[PDB]
Amino acid sequence: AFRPISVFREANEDESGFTCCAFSARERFLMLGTCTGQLKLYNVFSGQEEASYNCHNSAITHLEPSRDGSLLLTSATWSQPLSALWGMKSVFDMKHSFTEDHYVEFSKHSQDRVIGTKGDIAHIYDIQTGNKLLTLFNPDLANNYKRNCATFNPTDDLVLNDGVLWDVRSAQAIHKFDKFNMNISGVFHPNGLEVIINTEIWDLRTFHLLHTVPALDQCRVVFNHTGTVMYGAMLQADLMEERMKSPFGSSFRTFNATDYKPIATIDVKRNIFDLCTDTKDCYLAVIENQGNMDTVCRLYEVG
Amino acid sequence: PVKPNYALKFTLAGHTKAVSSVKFSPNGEWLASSSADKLIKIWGAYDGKFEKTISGHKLGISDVAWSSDSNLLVSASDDKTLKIWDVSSGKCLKTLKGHSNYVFCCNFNPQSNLIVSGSFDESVRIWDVKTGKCLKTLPAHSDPVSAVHFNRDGSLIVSSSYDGLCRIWDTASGQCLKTLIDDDNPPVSFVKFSPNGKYILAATLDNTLKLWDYSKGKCLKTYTGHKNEKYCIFANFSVTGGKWIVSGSEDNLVYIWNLQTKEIVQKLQGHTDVVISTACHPTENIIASAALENDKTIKLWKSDC
């Protein structure tokens, strides 16, 4: 179901330091973050490094390009600014910085905003001015998820933060989901009608429990661009004074996005740093550790 | 040109994680070590014999320091505190709370009535040893603080930061009295006053050590050849015999330079991971080195000059 197509390691480096990836708008090219805070563009088929930019003073943890190719979000590890927004048209340069947000995402329908996470707190920013439009936090409703990531829903009208559903327009909390794990705060399903919070699938129409999916415990997920398949990989799991470990284990799984039934389990026999698919879902790129950190990017054909 | 002949005498095993800092007691009798394993250990400086373990920090310790009379220790921990310890009893006398993130570096003043600390939180704090209270919080830097040190008479503090600056502080007033920056501003990963108080020795994460006339803001000496781009490696003046500069290195060697001529005079091999800490014995030509998570040992070396 996943045929190896290409593999490459980081050019000009004793130990290869790829940490995360996303395809760029320009097609045979993948953007990769590295453990030295650099952003690199690579031809996924030849393995040729095409460009390199210094973005942060610590390792890149996560990145996200805008759908129109003009903008890029990055997040680092410990150095401030923890996240940044980069202009990609013409000269690659920093447009805005989010100095304390460990994680950021674009809004989804209209990509005119950024949502940042700082611990339990969500910040919503305007892309053009960089101004903080909203802070969302309520200490009575907080779940204190250790890996909380705030996120917009598909139509940008709702936010999930620390397991609390927020109405953006009114800046009001409309529902707190109970805490059933220590780490994962949950995401919106692309259909806009349910949320996936660790092993719990909650209906947004009623807040009833639609599904128990035990294989999603401690998982980050991403969907194909039609919203019909979901990829899931399990966080590795435990003080920033340690050597660099891969965020994920050695396997990912695909699920039917409508009923959460398993499709495939893929054990690559190496710890996983990141994975992504292209807008057409022809290709899957996975950052995999050889074996100490020494990563390669492996490109697979999506069958 | 005379060269030292440091040779390995003992390997001290016992910590179960990276060893962050080794320090000889001022009276020359003891070596104290701190570790990511949350423990402080005391060893015999001349025989390397384990003496005792001191415990209480809840997370890793990155630094430890002796009081002038060799009776007290202070330690700086990722648990956001420092602790003052009575060494002979092993008991925690005070826990210094106030930093909002990991405490990376600490030192007593020579008078032993003050402790200076530096933190990931970008501040330098001065604490009352006897009350355990923070006397001053200095907004020292705009990035994490990697080292702090009193000068010989305690009137000055020097601090170094990832912001690329070394800064000198008036102990009494807390006023910054000097900002040292040269041709670039790579992170300053280590700094300390020279024994005579006239100079500072500063490490930057560009594989470089620099001896500074901080009064005149002039760099007098530059030492290179080692590897140092990532870790905050402690360096030293060796003054018991020849006048050397000593530092660990990310290629797992101890480097020793001629202070005046800047040439490498010895490289000590043996460790199996970054040599992140070195210390020079107060009266004999003895060096302690300590290495990170894939080594976990301290080593004692002795030279005829």
From Swiss-Prot, chain A:
Induction: Up-regulated in a number of cancer cell lines (at protein level). A motif (DWD box 2) lies at residues 200-207. It comes from the Eukaryota. Residues 13-212 are annotated as: WD repeat-like region. It is found in: Cytoplasm; Nucleus; Cytoplasm, Cytoskeleton, Microtubule organizing center, Centrosome. Ubiquitously expressed. Belongs to the VPRBP/DCAF1 family. This is DDB1- and CUL4-associated factor 1. It comes from Homo sapiens. The chain holds residues 1080 to 1390 of 1507 of the full protein.
Curated annotation (Swiss-Prot), chain B:
The keyword Transcription applies. SMART domains: WD40. Changing residue 260 to A: Reduced interaction with RBBP5 and reduced ability to stimulate KMT2A methyltransferase activity in association with RBBP5 and ASH2L. Changing residue 120 to A: Significant decrease in interaction with KMT2A. There is a cross-link at residue 17 (Glycyl lysine isopeptide (Lys-Gly) (interchain with G-Cter in SUMO2)). It is found in: Nucleus. The record marks 78, 104, 234, 293 as: Important for interaction with histone H3. GO terms for cellular component: ATAC complex; histone acetyltransferase complex; histone methyltransferase complex; mitotic spindle; MLL1 complex; MLL1/2 complex; MLL3/4 complex; NSL complex. Keywords: Acetylation, Chromatin regulator, Host-virus interaction, Isopeptide bond, Nucleus, Repeat, Transcription, Transcription regulation, Ubl conjugation, WD repeat. Changing residue 211 to K: Loss of interaction with RBBP5 and reduced ability to stimulate KMT2A methyltransferase activity in association with RBBP5 and ASH2L. Interacts with PAXBP1; the interaction is direct and links a WDR5-containing histone methyltransferase complex to PAX7 and PAX3. Interacts with HCFC1. Component of the ATAC complex, a complex with histone acetyltransferase activity on histones H3 and H4. Component of the SET1 complex, at least composed of the catalytic subunit (SETD1A or SETD1B), WDR5, WDR82, RBBP5, ASH2L/ASH2, CXXC1/CFP1, HCFC1 and DPY30. Core component of several methyltransferase-containing complexes including MLL1/MLL, MLL2/3 (also named ASCOM complex) and MLL4/WBP7. Belongs to the WD repeat WDR5/wds family. This is WD repeat-containing protein 5. It comes from Homo sapiens (Human). The lineage of its organism: Eukaryota, Metazoa, Chordata, Craniata, Vertebrata.
